[PDB]
Design a protein around this ligand. Sequence first.
Ligand SMILES: C[S@@+](CC[C@H](N)C(=O)[O-])C[C@H]1O[C@@H](n2cnc3c(N)ncnc32)[C@H](O)[C@@H]1O
Length: 234
Amino acid sequence: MLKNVLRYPGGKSKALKYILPNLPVGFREYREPMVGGGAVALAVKQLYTNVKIKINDLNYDLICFWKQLRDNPVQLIEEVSKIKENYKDGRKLYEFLTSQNGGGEFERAVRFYILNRITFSGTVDSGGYSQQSFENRFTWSAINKLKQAAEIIKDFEISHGDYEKLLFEPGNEVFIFLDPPYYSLSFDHERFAFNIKKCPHLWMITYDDSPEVRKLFKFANIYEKELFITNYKL
Ligand SMILES: C[S@@+](CC[C@H](N)C(=O)[O-])C[C@H]1O[C@@H](n2cnc3c(N)ncnc32)[C@H](O)[C@@H]1O
């Protein structure tokens, strides 16, 4: 049972024991419109094989990764493996990857995956290069899991852009799992709350407990410092 291919501090692989038992009954379509590492998407596909899965993110480089893992896994794994073999100095690997700009999907996928493994917590901007990540997270064992990951996600629909599209796309027995950037360009929580109120599907939001979040989502069901916010009774 594959848990994670990507490292995110706000990853939900540990929260699954709380999330999975509280999915709505009979959902046939799963949407993750802010997928990031997609712990929940990976878990749902492995526990419910007949569900249609749609994942989305605003982060173009992250979506290049997911599309290239789905569509081009052999080439992606081989290029990542070659770079791991050739760049024995992690700081020089970092400097090489961070100095690249632009690229097609494949180049973006390779760069995104390796930066995810060699950074402090998965991103350049939130702690930069970590020698500890380079030695203990950028491992053959993590690379080895990409082939199984590519198999799990083969029939995923994958898009880049705003979460609104998957909120409002018509469909039947749709469940939407939302894990926004934590509550403080920064994420517009007011726009999010405004759009989710009009979402015609069943949804669950994960937020850190805050009075500001309790107030913004007073209209909804809040369950207990982590919150599950839903429009269906658990
Ligand atoms: C807390 S992370 C969710 C990660 C996911 N739960 C996991 O297991 O890794 C929030 C995500 O929201 C994405 N995001 C931010 N603004 C967005 C937007 N307007 N539309 C879609 N995704 C967005 C970020 O790129 C980030 O990947």
